Scaffold this active site. Structure first.
Site, short mmCIF file in Angstrom:
data_model
loop_
_atom_site.label_atom_id
_atom_site.label_comp_id
_atom_site.label_asym_id
_atom_site.label_seq_id
_atom_site.Cartn_x
_atom_site.Cartn_y
_atom_site.Cartn_z
N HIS A 151 0.81 -1.20 0.00
CA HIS A 151 0.00 0.00 0.00
C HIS A 151 0.84 1.25 0.00
O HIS A 151 0.32 2.31 -0.35
CB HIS A 151 -0.95 0.03 1.19
CG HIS A 151 -0.43 0.41 2.57
ND1 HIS A 151 -0.39 -0.41 3.62
CD2 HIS A 151 0.05 1.64 2.98
CE1 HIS A 151 0.08 0.25 4.63
NE2 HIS A 151 0.34 1.49 4.25
N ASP A 172 -0.36 -7.49 1.89
CA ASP A 172 0.18 -6.16 1.91
C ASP A 172 1.70 -6.22 2.08
O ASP A 172 2.29 -5.95 3.12
CB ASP A 172 -0.54 -5.37 3.04
CG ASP A 172 -0.33 -3.84 2.93
OD1 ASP A 172 0.25 -3.38 1.95
OD2 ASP A 172 -0.69 -3.10 3.84
N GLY A 191 2.76 6.50 8.57
CA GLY A 191 4.18 6.75 8.31
C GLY A 191 5.10 5.64 8.83
O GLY A 191 6.30 5.67 8.58
N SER A 213 3.97 2.52 8.33
CA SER A 213 3.57 1.47 7.38
C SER A 213 4.71 0.92 6.57
O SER A 213 5.59 1.70 6.18
CB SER A 213 2.64 2.01 6.44
OG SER A 213 1.40 2.09 7.08
N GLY A 214 4.78 -0.39 6.37
CA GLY A 214 5.91 -0.94 5.60
C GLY A 214 7.13 -1.37 6.43
O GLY A 214 7.96 -2.18 5.98
C1 LIG Z 1 -7.77 8.88 13.65
C2 LIG Z 1 -8.16 8.38 12.28
C3 LIG Z 1 -8.07 9.44 11.18
C4 LIG Z 1 -7.28 7.18 11.84
C5 LIG Z 1 -7.56 6.58 10.60
C6 LIG Z 1 -6.78 5.54 10.13
C7 LIG Z 1 -5.69 5.08 10.88
N1 LIG Z 1 -4.78 4.25 10.33
C8 LIG Z 1 -5.02 3.21 9.46
O1 LIG Z 1 -6.05 2.51 9.29
C9 LIG Z 1 -3.69 2.81 8.80
C10 LIG Z 1 -2.49 3.68 9.08
C11 LIG Z 1 -1.37 2.92 9.66
C12 LIG Z 1 -0.74 1.93 8.94
C13 LIG Z 1 0.29 1.21 9.52
C14 LIG Z 1 0.67 1.51 10.82
C15 LIG Z 1 0.04 2.50 11.53
C16 LIG Z 1 -0.99 3.22 10.95
N2 LIG Z 1 -3.64 2.88 7.36
C17 LIG Z 1 -3.45 1.87 6.52
O2 LIG Z 1 -3.71 0.70 6.72
C18 LIG Z 1 -3.04 2.49 5.18
C19 LIG Z 1 -3.11 1.34 4.16
C20 LIG Z 1 -4.07 1.75 3.03
C21 LIG Z 1 -4.37 0.58 2.10
C22 LIG Z 1 -5.04 1.04 0.79
N3 LIG Z 1 -4.08 1.64 -0.12
N4 LIG Z 1 -1.69 3.05 5.50
C23 LIG Z 1 -1.14 4.18 4.96
O3 LIG Z 1 -1.57 4.54 3.84
C24 LIG Z 1 0.12 4.94 5.67
F1 LIG Z 1 1.36 4.73 5.19
F2 LIG Z 1 -0.01 6.30 5.59
F3 LIG Z 1 0.24 4.68 7.00
C25 LIG Z 1 -5.41 5.68 12.13
C26 LIG Z 1 -6.20 6.72 12.61
#
Ligand SMILES: CC(C)c1ccc(NC(=O)[C@H](Cc2ccccc2)NC(=O)[C@H](CCCC[NH3+])NC(=O)C(F)(F)F)cc1
Ligand SMILES: [Ca+2]
Length: 240
Positions: free
Chosen positions: A45, A93, A186, A188-189
């Site tokens: 992702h 992923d 940030g 992620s990965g």
């Molecule tokens: C408070 C609210 C806006 C909120 C919404 C979403 C999240 N996060 C999420 O649900 C996490 C973010 C993340 C990933 C890994 C580790 C930590 C956090 N996001 C993810 O799973 C997405 C993957 C998208 C897949 C489709 N292309 N990660 C991301 O794009 C990244 F790199 F910015 F972190 C956390 C808080």
């Protein structure tokens, strides 16, 4: 990393920062793990946008010359054939990036040790997440590498009602969930490093947290279980 601590300079040398080109500058988007001198493992992702990317190995402070960094361009992106952008909860992923040059290994730049295929960690296994992501939910990127102690939550517990339920699959590792420490945007990965037979090994690739917030009680950080992907990883590096 929410509820993290500053990593020492040499503690986690397989950690990389994946950056994309922004104007004249370069910004951090994701972590990764150096697995060969010319290959990085990160989450699929992270490279779904068709951006120009670079990898920084030996990085500590994003916003400051450390005197230990090597910058190398990404030449080839192999994402998992089954990855779907619209369904992160399906899994897969994971992506592999072929670097344009082989990096030089020193006490700051080392390859990450992968687990043996099929290895599942017992519940409450000692693991650490490292990264430069958000230090609070909707906060900002850290400028130094952070680490957080995140014990695993095994699949039975993690897929239970209270926790992630059906969203987590057996191809994933859950770690954390205490409402205090967590992975965040940030990170992620990046690696989840777990101490195994006296050796740290990279067991997770960071994939998601809750839509509600990063550090949420009973919503562990979720990782691609690396040991579920060892034959695919090897098969890619052999051919490419
Ligand atoms: C408070 C609210 C806006 C909120 C919404 C979403 C999240 N996060 C999420 O649900 C996490 C973010 C993340 C990933 C890994 C580790 C930590 C956090 N996001 C993810 O799973 C997405 C993957 C998208 C897949 C489709 N292309 N990660 C991301 O794009 C990244 F790199 F910015 F972190 C956390 C808080
Ligand atoms: Ca730097």
């Amino acid at each position: 990393v929410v509820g993290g601590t500053e990593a020492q300079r040499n503690s986690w040398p397989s950690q990389i920062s994946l950056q994309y080109r922004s104007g004249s500058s370069w910004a951090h988007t994701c972590g990764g793990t150096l697995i060969r001198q010319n290959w990085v493992m990160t989450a699929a992702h992270c490279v779904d946008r068709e951006l120009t990317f670079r990898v920084v190995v030996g990085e500590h402070n994003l916003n400051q010359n450390n005197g230990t960094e090597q910058y190398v361009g990404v030449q080839k992106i192999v994402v998992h054939p089954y990855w779907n952008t619209d369904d992160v909860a399906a899994g897969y992923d994971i992506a592999l990036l072929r670097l344009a040059q082989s990096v030089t290994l020193n006490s700051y730049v080392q390859l990450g040790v992968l687990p043996r295929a099929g290895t599942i960690l017992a519940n409450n296994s000692p693991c650490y997440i490292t990264g430069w992501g958000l230090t609070r939910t909707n906060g900002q990127l850290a400028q130094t590498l952070q680490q957080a102690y995140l014990p695993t939550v095994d699949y039975a517990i993690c897929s239970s009602s209270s926790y992630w339920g059906s969203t987590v699959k057996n191809s994933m590792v859950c770690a954390g969930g205490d409402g205090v420490r967590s992975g965040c945007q940030g990170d992620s990965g990046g690696p989840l490093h777990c101490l195994v037979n006296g050796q740290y090994a990279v067991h997770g690739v960071t994939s998601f947290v809750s839509r509600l917030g990063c550090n949420v009680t009973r919503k562990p950080t979720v990782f691609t279980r690396v040991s579920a992907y060892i034959s695919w990883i090897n098969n890619v590096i052999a051919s490419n």
